[PDB]
């Protein structure tokens, strides 16, 4: 069966739009699940003793839009109050109610497909014995798939994938590689090098394919407690070439951070 | 009836409170205080509601083996304010009995 909504009803009866159908539509347009909200304080809520008056706040919960117009919720003293919007569709006259609770009791109940009361926390109000000391809103989550954007401004942080690899390069040299967004790599040198000549390939493990650069990368390192330095080349094939001076039998501690890009242009 | 409470007030100070008839409290000081300044709220646990007085109570204490003293204020809100001199990194043993009434005339 296919149930159509955003279509012409030839005889004005074919496709009526039910509130749960619009609920699902709206959830899909904004990219929200049953565990988040859309919320906007058009005017500031007002705190009076152990109460919060929502003067003009709009909320979308489970794709259902409602407005809090001079709606006061009573609070517990000396407590962290979790303010919830509770939707009970069977309460035909008043489906929505607000509650102040001791914990975040958001239940993710699918009210558009099934039975039950949807509870979703949208505000955290901390009190003293006499009134409100602080308020923190619950985050509004947008769950998206693939985004094409021109410009973006981030006020908090971007979390990208991170991969790590330790390479026993040979001759006592160790590399600890950290790759972020599958592109930027920071190499940290460890260990102590001995028995190597300039231009010689190091005697150990080659860099794993996921960390290999598209072009040769020369990474500068330093000898601990000395005024001397070295460099190594991480070749596109994964091999590592020594480009410091010749090192004898006595190991010298190797340290330092070097960065490279795995990906080139295009 | 008798109720007891141990408060780790912070900065190494420990209060052992005994309340009788739900009114008269005797505070016994224990522990050793360090890293505190005059007028500063102590860094630990506040006094539980059943032991909080209606009005601020200043309780005199003594530094063991010294001729020096201190006082703390148990505030109606449960907080404890240090009113001795500034204390450095070296803790000095704090002792003494102080009494207060929870209830005023009502």
């Amino acid at each position: 069966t296919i149930k159509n909504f955003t279509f012409f009803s030839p005889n004005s009866t074919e496709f009526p739009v039910g509130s749960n159908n619009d609920g699902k539509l709206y959830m899909m347009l904004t990219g929200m699940d049953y565990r988040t909200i859309r919320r906007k304080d058009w005017s500031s809520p007002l705190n009076t003793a152990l109460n919060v008056q929502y003067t003009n706040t709009s909320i979308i919960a489970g794709g259902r839009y409602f407005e809090l117009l001079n709606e006061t919720v009573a609070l517990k003293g000396d407590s962290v109050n979790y303010i919830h919007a509770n939707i009970d569709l069977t309460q035909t006259a008043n489906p929505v109610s607000l509650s102040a609770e001791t914990a975040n009791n958001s239940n993710g109940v699918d009210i558009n497909n099934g039975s039950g009361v949807l509870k979703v926390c949208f505000d955290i109000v901390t009190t003293s014995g006499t009134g409100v000391t602080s308020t923190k809103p619950i985050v509004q989550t947008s769950t998206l798939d693939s985004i094409s954007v021109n410009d973006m401004t981030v006020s908090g942080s971007i979390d990208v994938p991170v991969q790590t690899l330790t390479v026993e390069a040979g001759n006592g040299l160790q590399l600890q590689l950290t790759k972020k967004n599958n592109d930027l790599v920071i190499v940290r040198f460890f260990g102590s090098v001995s028995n190597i000549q300039k231009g010689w390939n190091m005697s150990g493990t080659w860099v794993d394919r996921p960390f290999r650069p598209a072009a040769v990368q020369s990474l500068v390192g330093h000898f601990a407690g000395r005024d001397t330095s070295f460099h190594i080349d991480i070749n596109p094939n994964g091999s590592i070439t020594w480009w410091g001076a010749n090192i004898d039998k006595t190991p010298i501690a190797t340290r330092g951070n070097g960065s490279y890009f795995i990906k080139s242009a295009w | 009836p008798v109720q007891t409470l141990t408060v780790e007030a912070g900065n190494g100070l420990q209060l052992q409170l005994t309340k009788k008839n739900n009114d008269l409290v005797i505070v016994r000081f224990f522990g050793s205080v360090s890293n505190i300044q005059k007028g500063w709220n102590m860094s630990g646990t506040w006094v539980d509601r059943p032991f909080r007085p209606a009005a601020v109570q200043s309780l005199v204490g003594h530094f063991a083996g010294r001729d020096t003293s201190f006082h703390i204020d148990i505030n109606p809100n449960g907080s404890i304010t240090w009113w001795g001199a500034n204390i450095d990194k070296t803790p000095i043993a704090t002792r003494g009995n102080g009494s207060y009434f929870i209830k005023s005339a009502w």
Partner: nanobody, 122 residues
Framework: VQLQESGGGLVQAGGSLRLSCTAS????????MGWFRQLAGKEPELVVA????????YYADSVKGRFTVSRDSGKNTVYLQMNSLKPEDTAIYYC????????????????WGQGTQVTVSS
């Protein structure tokens, strides 16, 4: 527990300026009224505070002998007379008030203000 933050603006280095703050009510005993400083995007820190019940002041070592905190009658109003100003002193000065004495912790303060911006010109 509402706060008013009168006074504050622009002045030259080595000069003088003032700050005013009034609290709607006092939350209890050991009533402390003062100011938290926030320089170059760093963490906010208490710099000037007055214990009303004890008439005892606290000044951070960095501002000692330069700043003076005063009280006006029983109006629950605090003033900061800032003399011999420095470029480092350019920060956002929020008004803080609480019952229980002086504290480094933000949360322990019953009253927190908007924050008046201090700009020490060079």
């Amino acid at each position: 527990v509402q706060l008013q933050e009168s006074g504050g603006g622009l002045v030259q280095a080595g000069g003088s300026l003032r700050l005013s703050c009034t609290a709607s009510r006092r939350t209890g005993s050991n009533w402390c009224m003062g100011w938290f400083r926030q320089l170059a995007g760093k963490e906010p820190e208490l710099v000037v505070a007055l214990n009303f019940d004890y008439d005892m002041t606290y000044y951070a070592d960095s501002v000692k002998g330069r700043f003076t905190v005063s009280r006006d009658s029983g109006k629950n109003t605090v003033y900061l007379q800032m003399n011999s100003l420095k470029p480092e002193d350019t920060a956002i000065y929020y008004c803080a008030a609480r019952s229980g004495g002086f504290s480094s912790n933000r949360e322990l303060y019953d009253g927190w203000g908007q924050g008046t911006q201090v700009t020490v010109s060079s």
